[PDB]
Amino acid sequence: KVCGENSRHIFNMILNSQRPQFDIKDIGMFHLIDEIERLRKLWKDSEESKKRLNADMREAEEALAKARKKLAMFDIDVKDTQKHLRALMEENKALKLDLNVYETRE
Amino acid sequence: KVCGENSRHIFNMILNSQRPQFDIKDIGMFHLIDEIERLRKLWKDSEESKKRLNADMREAEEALAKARKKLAMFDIDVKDTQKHLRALMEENKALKLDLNV
Amino acid sequence: RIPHSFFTQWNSELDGSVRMEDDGSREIPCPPTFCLTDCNDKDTVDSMYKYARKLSSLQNSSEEGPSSTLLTMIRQYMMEADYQRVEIARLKDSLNDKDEEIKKLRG
Amino acid sequence: ERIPHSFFTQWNSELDGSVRCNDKDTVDSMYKYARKLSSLQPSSTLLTMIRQYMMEADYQRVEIARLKDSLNDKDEEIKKL
Structure with a gap:
């Protein structure tokens, strides 16, 4: 009778009135940042390994480049030395033939 | 005048008890999630790029190993003919000595 | 000025109608998982967006x-x-x- | 109960006028921001x-x-x- 129904309804709403509050730890803000930092290390560790592997790769490519030039020279050297061998064999054959003719004549 | 001071004070207090001093869009929740996904893509790209460099490295090392095998073959043959060459030189010199007396 | 009898009858009558409630409506929903299992775990990132969307829509846009x-x-x-x-x-x-x-x- | 619109209009007006990369530095800034935001909370x-x-x-x-x-x-x- 004395306390109006309107008065009660409002007092109840105010008592039950709430933001309601979002605690930052509860909604996951610190957890979200933890995950960002966790991803940073995973990305950096992969990039570090990618940095280090790239230097091993360029070294292999450079040594491969030096070897193939040497492979080009050796092919020239092999054929040329074989030709020098043939000339000396022919000189050797001829010198022996001369010596063997002249000795039989002596 | 008409609106009593008590009426204003109570309404103001209630206004301050309902206002969101931390809007989730405003405090940056979506931006942080944006960053996790962005870093995820960069992490994935790095792991993928690292996979291919390993495949590039296995080929480069194998071809270098093949070249070094060839380099040894050529060097053994070169040294072998050089050995016969030195012998023929020794032999030719002696033959000339016979003819020259 | 208020008579003391009206005063006590009113205050007590208001208090006897006060009902503090927790149906769970104004409670905050629990978060999913905040850890990516691998670099292909986009489902977890989706669950984060889903939670954040649930969260912001839940009160701050809605409780107004x-x-x-x-x-x-x-x-x-x-x-x-x-x-x-x-x-x-x-x-x-x-x-x-x-x-x-x-x-x-x-x- | 029944409020004349002249009073309704003046009271509202009276009330409404009384309302009064690979870096670690930036990550540490995020914690810092959320650490004071939590302290403010x-x-x-x-x-x-x-x-x-x-x-x-x-x-x-x-x-x-x-x-x-x-x-x-x-x-x-x-x-x-």
């Missing part, structure tokens, strides 16, 4: 709706109380006028 | 002001009805005389 009910109801309540203050003043002045008028009838 | 005086207020408002209502009865009494006290 039921809280507006309090703001509108308190507004009409107080405007009514403030108007009755002038209605009271008018009725008292009207009562005083009739007091001075009752005497003339005697004469 | 119904009053008892509101509850006790709204109680008095609503008690006055409900008392004014029966006080009105008292004056209205006492008003008809004076009318027939005029009406008879």
